[PDB]
Enzyme design. Structure first.
Site, PDB file in Angstrom:
ATOM      1  N   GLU A   1     -18.742  -3.670  23.795  1.00  0.00           N
ATOM      2  CA  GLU A   1     -18.218  -4.804  24.020  1.00  0.00           C
ATOM      3  C   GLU A   1     -16.854  -4.690  23.185  1.00  0.00           C
ATOM      4  O   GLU A   1     -15.561  -5.187  23.564  1.00  0.00           O
ATOM      5  CB  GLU A   1     -18.585  -6.171  23.684  1.00  0.00           C
ATOM      6  CG  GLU A   1     -20.059  -6.414  24.310  1.00  0.00           C
ATOM      7  CD  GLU A   1     -21.235  -5.775  24.044  1.00  0.00           C
ATOM      8  OE1 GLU A   1     -21.205  -5.009  22.927  1.00  0.00           O
ATOM      9  OE2 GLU A   1     -22.230  -6.088  24.893  1.00  0.00           O
TER      10      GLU A   1
ATOM     11  N   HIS B   1      -4.258   3.087  -3.546  1.00  0.00           N
ATOM     12  CA  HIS B   1      -4.343   2.607  -2.296  1.00  0.00           C
ATOM     13  C   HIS B   1      -3.627   1.291  -1.820  1.00  0.00           C
ATOM     14  O   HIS B   1      -3.065   1.112  -1.045  1.00  0.00           O
ATOM     15  CB  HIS B   1      -5.875   2.283  -1.960  1.00  0.00           C
ATOM     16  CG  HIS B   1      -6.320   1.551  -0.758  1.00  0.00           C
ATOM     17  ND1 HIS B   1      -6.247   1.903   0.397  1.00  0.00           N
ATOM     18  CD2 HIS B   1      -6.365   0.157  -0.704  1.00  0.00           C
ATOM     19  CE1 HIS B   1      -6.347   1.038   1.293  1.00  0.00           C
ATOM     20  NE2 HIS B   1      -6.561  -0.090   0.650  1.00  0.00           N
TER      21      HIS B   1
ATOM     22  N   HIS C   1     -29.810 -15.034  23.524  1.00  0.00           N
ATOM     23  CA  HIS C   1     -29.081 -14.739  24.427  1.00  0.00           C
ATOM     24  C   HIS C   1     -28.415 -16.270  24.898  1.00  0.00           C
ATOM     25  O   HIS C   1     -27.894 -16.140  26.135  1.00  0.00           O
ATOM     26  CB  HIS C   1     -29.711 -14.276  25.605  1.00  0.00           C
ATOM     27  CG  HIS C   1     -30.234 -12.724  25.357  1.00  0.00           C
ATOM     28  ND1 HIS C   1     -29.547 -11.828  26.287  1.00  0.00           N
ATOM     29  CD2 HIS C   1     -30.855 -11.968  24.481  1.00  0.00           C
ATOM     30  CE1 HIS C   1     -30.167 -10.489  25.865  1.00  0.00           C
ATOM     31  NE2 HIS C   1     -30.631 -10.712  24.684  1.00  0.00           N
TER      32      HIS C   1
ATOM     33  N   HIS D   1       0.945  -1.186   0.159  1.00  0.00           N
ATOM     34  CA  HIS D   1      -0.046   0.265  -0.125  1.00  0.00           C
ATOM     35  C   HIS D   1       0.876   1.364  -0.007  1.00  0.00           C
ATOM     36  O   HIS D   1       1.363   1.527   0.988  1.00  0.00           O
ATOM     37  CB  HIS D   1      -0.835  -0.117   1.405  1.00  0.00           C
ATOM     38  CG  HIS D   1      -1.856  -1.083   1.269  1.00  0.00           C
ATOM     39  ND1 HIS D   1      -1.578  -2.377   1.707  1.00  0.00           N
ATOM     40  CD2 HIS D   1      -2.961  -1.461   1.188  1.00  0.00           C
ATOM     41  CE1 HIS D   1      -2.461  -3.403   1.625  1.00  0.00           C
ATOM     42  NE2 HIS D   1      -3.541  -2.567   1.217  1.00  0.00           N
TER      43      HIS D   1
HETATM   44  C1  LIG Z   1     -12.289  -4.423   9.568  1.00  0.00           C
HETATM   45  C2  LIG Z   1     -11.713  -4.061   8.279  1.00  0.00           C
HETATM   46  N1  LIG Z   1     -12.433  -4.007   6.956  1.00  0.00           N
HETATM   47  C3  LIG Z   1     -11.975  -3.840   5.995  1.00  0.00           C
HETATM   48  C4  LIG Z   1     -10.580  -3.727   5.710  1.00  0.00           C
HETATM   49  C5  LIG Z   1     -10.067  -3.528   4.414  1.00  0.00           C
HETATM   50  N2  LIG Z   1      -9.468  -2.276   4.043  1.00  0.00           N
HETATM   51  C6  LIG Z   1      -8.064  -1.984   4.190  1.00  0.00           C
HETATM   52  S1  LIG Z   1      -8.124  -0.329   3.864  1.00  0.00           S
HETATM   53  C7  LIG Z   1      -9.656  -0.176   3.576  1.00  0.00           C
HETATM   54  C8  LIG Z   1     -10.103   1.217   2.986  1.00  0.00           C
HETATM   55  C9  LIG Z   1      -9.363   2.232   3.866  1.00  0.00           C
HETATM   56  O1  LIG Z   1      -9.398   3.475   3.551  1.00  0.00           O
HETATM   57  P1  LIG Z   1      -8.343   4.419   4.224  1.00  0.00           P
HETATM   58  O2  LIG Z   1      -8.721   4.071   5.475  1.00  0.00           O
HETATM   59  O3  LIG Z   1      -9.513   5.357   3.790  1.00  0.00           O
HETATM   60  O4  LIG Z   1      -7.277   4.121   3.404  1.00  0.00           O
HETATM   61  P2  LIG Z   1      -6.346   4.976   2.408  1.00  0.00           P
HETATM   62  O5  LIG Z   1      -6.854   4.391   1.264  1.00  0.00           O
HETATM   63  O6  LIG Z   1      -6.718   6.527   2.482  1.00  0.00           O
HETATM   64  O7  LIG Z   1      -5.223   4.446   2.569  1.00  0.00           O
HETATM   65  C10 LIG Z   1     -10.092  -1.312   3.607  1.00  0.00           C
HETATM   66  C11 LIG Z   1     -11.676  -1.550   3.332  1.00  0.00           C
HETATM   67  C12 LIG Z   1      -9.774  -3.754   7.043  1.00  0.00           C
HETATM   68  N3  LIG Z   1      -8.568  -3.580   6.847  1.00  0.00           N
HETATM   69  N4  LIG Z   1     -10.567  -3.794   7.985  1.00  0.00           N
HETATM   70  C1  LIG Z   2     -24.866  -6.371  22.441  1.00  0.00           C
HETATM   71  C2  LIG Z   2     -25.790  -6.796  23.792  1.00  0.00           C
HETATM   72  N1  LIG Z   2     -24.783  -6.405  25.041  1.00  0.00           N
HETATM   73  C3  LIG Z   2     -25.476  -6.574  26.243  1.00  0.00           C
HETATM   74  C4  LIG Z   2     -26.541  -6.867  26.209  1.00  0.00           C
HETATM   75  C5  LIG Z   2     -27.409  -6.878  27.697  1.00  0.00           C
HETATM   76  N2  LIG Z   2     -28.369  -5.710  28.036  1.00  0.00           N
HETATM   77  C6  LIG Z   2     -29.577  -5.851  27.902  1.00  0.00           C
HETATM   78  S1  LIG Z   2     -30.306  -4.338  28.129  1.00  0.00           S
HETATM   79  C7  LIG Z   2     -28.918  -3.655  28.769  1.00  0.00           C
HETATM   80  C8  LIG Z   2     -28.629  -2.240  29.352  1.00  0.00           C
HETATM   81  C9  LIG Z   2     -29.439  -1.448  28.224  1.00  0.00           C
HETATM   82  O1  LIG Z   2     -29.914  -0.405  28.658  1.00  0.00           O
HETATM   83  P1  LIG Z   2     -31.098   0.421  28.095  1.00  0.00           P
HETATM   84  O2  LIG Z   2     -30.704  -0.005  27.006  1.00  0.00           O
HETATM   85  O3  LIG Z   2     -30.395   1.556  28.734  1.00  0.00           O
HETATM   86  O4  LIG Z   2     -32.233  -0.410  28.809  1.00  0.00           O
HETATM   87  P2  LIG Z   2     -33.313   0.022  29.771  1.00  0.00           P
HETATM   88  O5  LIG Z   2     -32.685  -0.309  31.151  1.00  0.00           O
HETATM   89  O6  LIG Z   2     -33.230   1.896  30.207  1.00  0.00           O
HETATM   90  O7  LIG Z   2     -34.393  -0.886  29.949  1.00  0.00           O
HETATM   91  C10 LIG Z   2     -27.748  -4.599  28.489  1.00  0.00           C
HETATM   92  C11 LIG Z   2     -26.240  -4.563  28.574  1.00  0.00           C
HETATM   93  C12 LIG Z   2     -27.445  -7.020  25.069  1.00  0.00           C
HETATM   94  N3  LIG Z   2     -28.673  -7.272  25.246  1.00  0.00           N
HETATM   95  N4  LIG Z   2     -26.861  -6.878  23.916  1.00  0.00           N
END
Ligand SMILES: Cc1ncc(C[n+]2csc(CCOP(=O)(O)OP(=O)(O)O)c2C)c(N)n1
Ligand SMILES: Cc1ncc(C[n+]2csc(CCOP(=O)(O)OP(=O)(O)O)c2C)c(N)n1
Ligand SMILES: [Ca+2]
Ligand SMILES: [Ca+2]
Lengths: 632, 632
Positions: free
Chosen positions: B391, B256, B453, B28
């Site tokens: 997460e 790129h 879940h 790159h």
């Molecule tokens: C999670 C993730 N998805 C896809 C890719 C593949 N990828 C590498 S760079 C790129 C485009 C990123 O562009 P930029 O961040 O804009 O790169 P620059 O072209 O300007 O060098 C992608 C899709 C990756 N490395 N990680």
């Molecule tokens: C990706 C993900 N992470 C964690 C959970 C567990 N979870 C369920 S509701 C909650 C808190 C969400 O709070 P809100 O969205 O604020 O719920 P409300 O308490 O006000 O009912 C979490 C951590 C989930 N369901 N999905």
């Protein structure tokens, strides 16, 4: 529409929800109580037919906070959907129609939710799908809204920012996101972990943002009227109190995820004018008012059907709803050496041409995944969707395209980055929707990009996931047969495809791709069977020829789909798997021990180098595999 | 510091990078050329010792766009790190020190990057880790910056918004994020997929935002001076031209990810005053100027060591750098029935008390995962980190804590939502860092929350991932032994833990947890061996007792770690795995066929109901397992 009827309706929703959670001794009463005033007002605005939840131009309602299921179910029951009071009394019980988080097997549920963030992205997808449906069928036939209820948890997840970015870009003025801002999460005050200026965040993504008290009926109604007129995607920030109406539990994190308790419910009912000694009570005025959705939705759908009858797009809608996959003439790749990303790209183009509702795109990797639908234009006018570097939201968006009613979507990235979208792939599987996942760059054959870009464990993941076929074709012909099965299947599929050129196979000797594994070479009294998928099949063919020259009879099995092979009868598996069976795959695929005595895989991460150098380093050579097979 | 020397330095970086990509015929070149002016100025601001890349108070530099590796390597070479010119000439070659994306085995590389978004979140983690290190050791000893270079792709990923949310909340005025805004991605114009107001986005998350021309040396320098004084995390939006200096390829998406070509490089060198006919040229003035980092960093580290000698925190730093895991007195859970989330929470508290650098937190699920470190306070003053519902960024943050130099971090969520952080877990594995993953709610035993879940395939995923131990303890004693191995191991570990109460085991009969699988029950001439992990071990013990009453001798094997068992010698495995071996796990675990003739698992998604109802539905009962074992 007056305060007394809205209060009674909202409290009906509260106490059904509370009573359901309490009877189950499980579930989430806080969000239902907090949201009950908003949903009561929203019921006046929602355009839907409870007797036909498939009506194409219905407003789509998504509860992204799927833990608020009891409220959704209360509303579906009250509105006249096919969900009974007895169903409500079996909340969270085995085999009920009212599971702890919503599932699409319950009529009225638009999309399965539960994993936070997904619903927000699905709602964006429904809004994009609606924009496309309007492009195809006209604004006389498609003109509905997409309403999403979400909470703090949804808006903290990355996928929510990804999807909302796309909603602003695409000017989705059919999308209304209602944020339940109650300042509470499981760990207590949301301020422990989050203090963004949410209005500024969303304005940065091209939204109009309204801010309300979510227990003031007049303000809720005014916000919905203004949201419905927006020229932007609209966010309503609704300040609420968790467990509103539940006395000592109001505003308490303890109300999030456990029953309120019998005495708390009694006191709550007393304060609201309900009899504390009865459960699952639906007051007459509320019952009549909520169930008016049946008459009103019947009339709106009838009016729409009249517009459809006059439309030039009647025949098109019929083709979209009844695609003919059997008519499709696929490319003939017999005897052609090619990378399976390239065969697959050709197939995508044939499908896009034959199927007016087939569309999709890549997460910024169109040119590498080979997914461009040539000359078919860019969304919304055309078919190519540019998802950006947003793998997770791409998949959750396409989940919604697949649920909308007229679309056959694909999502594409490198197989290593399937990990970024796996939670949404799981929802496709759970719902058994037809959504196709295109994963290129499938192994250490990637070469120079190195171990962060070289899949190892991803095949095991997708194979292990239920309701999900994982095809890894060895040539273009397998790639076609894989598509033919995928379109006819009742579950989603992934296609795991090479960067590098693969050698075309000879014809099947016994069985075919539809059996998951089949024979390419069959010998009487075989001492060995070499079983492989994808890029490793030619290694096995060559190794089997060397073994035969040394005096060992060999079978060679191509296994383009593990999950299909698991479904074959014992007599079929027995004919293939003869002698000492060795499985060979550029993956860490211990699952092959289900069919093989020995597995010749990869047990570490990969290496950055030329593809031929890396394959040789990891043992993928005829000399090395033959020495392994001969145990010396 | 003048324009002529900065131009020569930047062009030295450009042409080393271009020449490396070209020699490899892979890589790159666009980002390196676009970033070369920024990194040339940044080299004057960066505080680091090339001869001691472990210096605790060094500025931390992260290339989130790890595809820009050739530029990083050029800079490390020029600055005096242990990376040679010959190493640069082996870019992207098997076994070189210059792999296609950066790996921590190359000295000077702070963290492995490549998967987009991770680096941004890692940089946030380094900044949080630095804030904690300052809390422990004082601002006399910890006062450095964290610089991150990122691109469009990074900022489109959800994880970038998650981490940047946390950076604003925690007022990380040690964090400087430099965004390479070149308007180009793989699919071409970034406008096809992204049009956010990036300044407004980041201001919403509590950042100061500066906007510059990234090819103007004076503006770059001025922005860095202002950023270094910020009271907020700071974003520098640097407008650049991809492949700046490469003539017909300037601003082209074709730059790129493929070599510029020999003739393009020749023309580029001509325009810059370099000889087109020489490759890997380092001009004298640039060489001297970049390598001055060696003298300057030696002097800064010496000054710091003098501050350390005067510090009251000398002994503490020595304990942080040399933790004594053998001294720790764990809880004694012998004979105690408990959920393993509860045993594990007790162990976390014992470790937090014994180990000044042990800390971590949950993604809003502290109370459910049982991860609160009681009375140890909230970050930064204390040890409990409130990650929010984030997460993925939690895991990438903790990856950086684990790299900082003095910390032992844990990340916690429900096992189903391990899928949201798996790409970052993979980076922990790739780097072989000590980062501990706490995954509760491990099976259909979750019950009422239902199939979204209830883990099914996640055990297969984590087992298949290399360099990653996956412990699934059956009781508190196994949970302790698992920790003891995890702290001593050279790779990360996950702990897969129950919601529901499990029965305490009797003592090992032969082997122990360190062997991965061991015997709980051993019979002479065993006809069957029942092998299980976690919650399924008591089912097997009971089933084996019923089998014995019917006249069948049985072994029972507890397998708290598959990966460890895979490493045992054949004689050990042979003693355990006697007769017909049946594996039993509430998971879809085809990998058990490696050790078992039959597998009694779960092949579908789960169901919403009471835990006892769901386990019975899926066959986890003594009567059903015994009928299966007896094949009738
Ligand atoms: C999670 C993730 N998805 C896809 C890719 C593949 N990828 C590498 S760079 C790129 C485009 C990123 O562009 P930029 O961040 O804009 O790169 P620059 O072209 O300007 O060098 C992608 C899709 C990756 N490395 N990680
Ligand atoms: C990706 C993900 N992470 C964690 C959970 C567990 N979870 C369920 S509701 C909650 C808190 C969400 O709070 P809100 O969205 O604020 O719920 P409300 O308490 O006000 O009912 C979490 C951590 C989930 N369901 N999905
Ligand atoms: Ca909340
Ligand atoms: Ca870019």
């Amino acid at each position: 529409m007056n305060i007394q009827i809205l209060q009674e309706q909202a409290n009906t929703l509260r106490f059904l929800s509370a009573d359901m959670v309490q009877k189950a001794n499980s579930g989430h009463p806080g969000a239902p109580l907090g949201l009950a005033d908003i949903l009561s007002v929203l019921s006046y605005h929602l355009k839907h037919n409870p007797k036909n939840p498939t009506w194409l131009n219905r407003d789509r309602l998504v509860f992204s906070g799927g833990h608020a299921s009891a409220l959704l179910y209360s509303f579906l029951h009250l509105s006249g959907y096919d969900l009974s009071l007895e169903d409500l009394k079996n909340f969270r019980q085995l085999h009920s129609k009212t599971p702890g988080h919503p599932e699409i097997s319950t009529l009225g549920v638009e999309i399965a939710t539960g994993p936070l963030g997904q619903g927000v992205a699905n709602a964006v997808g429904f809004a994009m799908a609606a924009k496309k449906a309007q492009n195809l069928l006209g604004s006389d036939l498609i003109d509905h809204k997409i309403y999403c209820l979400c909470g703090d948890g949804d808006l903290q997840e990355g996928i929510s920012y990804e999807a909302c970015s796309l909603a602003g870009l695409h000017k989705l003025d059919n999308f209304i996101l209602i944020y339940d801002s109650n300042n509470i999460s499981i760990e207590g005050d949301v301020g422990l972990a989050f203090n963004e200026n949410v209005k500024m965040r969303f304005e940065a993504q091209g939204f109009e943002v309204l801010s309300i008290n979510g227990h003031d009926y007049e303000e809720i109604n005014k916000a919905l009227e203004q949201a419905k007129k927006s020229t932007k995607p609209c966010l309503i920030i609704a300040k609420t109190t968790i467990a509103k109406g539940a006395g000592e539990l109001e505003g308490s994190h303890k109300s999030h995820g456990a029953p309120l308790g019998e005495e708390v419910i009694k006191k709550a009912k007393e304060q609201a004018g309900f009899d504390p000694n009865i459960s699952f009570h639906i007051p007459q005025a509320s019952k009549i008012r909520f169930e008016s959705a049946v008459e009103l939705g019947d009339l709106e759908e009838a009016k729409w059907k009249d517009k459809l009858e006059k439309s030039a797009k009647k025949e098109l809608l019929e083709r979209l709803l009844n695609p003919d996959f059997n008519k499709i003439a696929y490319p003939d790749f017999k005897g052609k050496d090619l990378a399976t990303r390239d065969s697959n790209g050709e197939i995508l183009n044939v499908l896009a041409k034959n199927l007016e509702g087939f569309l999709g795109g890549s997460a910024d990797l169109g040119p590498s995944n080979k997914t461009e639908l040539h000359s078919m234009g860019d969304f919304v006018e055309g078919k190519n969707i540019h998802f950006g570097i947003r793998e997770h939201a791409m998949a959750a968006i396409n989940n919604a395209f697949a649920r909308y009613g007229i679309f056959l979507p694909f999502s594409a990235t490198f197989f290593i980055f399937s990990e970024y979208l796996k939670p949404a792939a799981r929802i496709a599987a759970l719902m058994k929707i037809k959504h196709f996942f295109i994963f290129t760059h499938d192994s250490i054959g990637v070469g120079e990009d190195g171990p962060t870009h070289q899949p190892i464990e991803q095949l095991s993941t997708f194979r292990a996931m239920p309701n999900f076929l994982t095809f890894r074709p060895a040539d273009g012909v397998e790639n076609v047969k894989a598509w033919q099965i995928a379109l006819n299947a009742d579950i989603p599929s992934a296609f795991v495809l090479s960067r590098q050129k693969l050698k075309a196979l000879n014809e099947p000797v016994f069985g075919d791709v539809k059996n998951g594994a089949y024979l390419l070479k069959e010998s009487k009294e075989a001492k060995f069977t070499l079983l492989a998928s994808g890029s490793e099949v030619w290694l096995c063919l060559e190794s089997a020829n060397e073994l035969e020259k040394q005096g060992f009879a060999c079978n060679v099995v191509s296994m383009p789909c593990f999950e299909l092979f698991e479904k074959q009868d014992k007599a079929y598996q027995e004919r293939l798997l003869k002698g000492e069976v060795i499985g060979v795959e550029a993956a860490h695929s211990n699952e092959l021990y289900k069919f093989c005595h020995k597995v010749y895989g990869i047990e570490s991460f990969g290496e950055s180098g030329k593809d031929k150098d890396v394959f040789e380093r990891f043992g993928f050579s005829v000399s090395k595999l033959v020495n392994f097979i001969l145990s010396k």
